[PDB]
Amino acid sequence: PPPDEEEQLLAKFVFGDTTDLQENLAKFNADF
Amino acid sequence: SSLSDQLAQVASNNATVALDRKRRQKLHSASLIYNSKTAATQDYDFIFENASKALEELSQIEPKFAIFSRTLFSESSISLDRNVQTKEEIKDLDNAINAYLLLASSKWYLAPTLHATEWLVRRFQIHVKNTEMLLLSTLNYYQTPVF
Amino acid sequence: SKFQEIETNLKKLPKLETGFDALANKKKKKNVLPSNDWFTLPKP
Amino acid sequence: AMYLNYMKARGNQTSYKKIHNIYNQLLKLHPTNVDIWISCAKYEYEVHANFKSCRNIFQNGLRFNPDVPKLWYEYVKFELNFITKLINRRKVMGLIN
């Protein structure tokens, strides 16, 4: 049982995952 | 101090949480485009989709809004509630809101920025949470109807 | 070989055209535009 | 039409009488909208090749709105396609047999 990138993408859609949202809010750092 | 003073303090802390229907209506009818009777019946999906349209217009005018489409205007942010995450996530999204506001301070003469920051007003409650940066950013426009 | 020309003719016959399933797959480009009585005598 | 597209694209698992039911109630509600008549007859000729029912659909649509020329043109188109398939199957049975 490996992971998968397309599976984890639409799994993040289906389970309502804001993990990448909080990652981007912590990451974006006002770089412009 | 008195009990009504301490309770005014806890009201000012809990200003943005909707604890029943009447507070949700009084708190969601605060729009920047529509009047109260339309703004209370609108949804998050409706105001999000036309704010995403206006952010695409604002981004083709000035291309530094695309990362706000990545984080602040993404579709995870329809369900992102502000007062349910901790202080560190709050300071992350509040410097995201500060970045958007001092980027779009210059653009305040053209309606895509009004329809785009409509979603910051109604989803993230920046008229009552991130309010000092909002006043300071649009202070120049004080003879105008947007101010 | 002896009928592939008429098979291609059946392939190129004009089919019945609708706009209904294209209407299912339609998308929009829409913006958002911003927001006395007859019988009452005049109170002097 | 999203309903009809999903129901058609469901494949072997759906039933063509289940598509017939939603065609029947959609044509009942919108008899004047003519692209539904064209789409109904197009599904039942260009997929199932049911000439009798396709003729019945076109005659019922022309009973309802005999005013738009588009339904007239698609009916003469269907009749020419049917007679062309008839004479081509005649030519094919000659060329084989």
Added chain:
Amino acid sequence: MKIKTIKRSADDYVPVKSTQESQMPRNLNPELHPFERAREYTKALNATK
């Protein structure tokens, strides 16, 4: 130390748009609903009356 409290979140319980009804979450625990014989006895008595 991991830690988790009740996050009620107010989007699931009081609706956003005003035109629609409030959510009624259910929980079928008999601990939550205690007097199950007396309550429907009184409903049957009020039905006979």
Added chain:
Amino acid sequence: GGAKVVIEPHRHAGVYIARGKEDLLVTKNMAPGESVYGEKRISVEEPVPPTKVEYRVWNPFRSKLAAGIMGGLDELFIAPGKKVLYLGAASGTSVSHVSDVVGPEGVVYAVEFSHRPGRELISMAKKRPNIIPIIEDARHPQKYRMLIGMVDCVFADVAQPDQARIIALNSHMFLKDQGGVVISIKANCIDSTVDAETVFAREVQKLREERIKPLEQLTLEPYERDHCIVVGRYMRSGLK
């Protein structure tokens, strides 16, 4: 004739009284600048400058409904936003007054069967857009059931002996529940072998047999001998 009056709102909404030394029942004019049957008018200058709006004198000797109003009816159902189905719109005499009492936001369906009155009704309904003239017999409401929907008051100025059946048919088709039923009964035109109180009692009994609860009747005596207005409401369930 060139004098000055003061306009004052009546108890009934949409109608007014002009007090002078003789006071006049008065309605607002929906088509300002012309008279319909030669009545006199009053032009006030109400306060872009002020606009000259005007008013029309309702003549009780040429209108059974005005005779009823100024004899004193406790409740007309003709009101400033309503829909009235006028039966027996014999010309545009009272239909014009009902029309501008009802106002621009309400509708008067004027049903008449003769044709030269219908021609005058259509030429009056040009300048009064809130009048739908219906040239048809009221004894068959199905012949115009397609043109009218869900009126609020019926007024009946028909003068036929099958009056109560006409009123009942038009009410059962187009009147809504607890709507108004205003009837002008003429005793001599119903039948002249019995007296006026007998024919009024029979007509009221016919109305409650067709389940229209009568609230009020008025004889309207100084303007018409042996007439009546019966005001009822369409109860539809439970006159009791």
Added chain:
RNA sequence: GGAAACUCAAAGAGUGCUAUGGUAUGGUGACGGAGUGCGCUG
């Protein structure tokens, strides 16, 4: 008594809104689709 209101509550009346399960999806591989046979309608 009076004044103010994006103030807080307690209640009353009317109006609006498809307000629509007369016994809830086409289907727990116990299933579905195709075809056949029986049944049914004119």
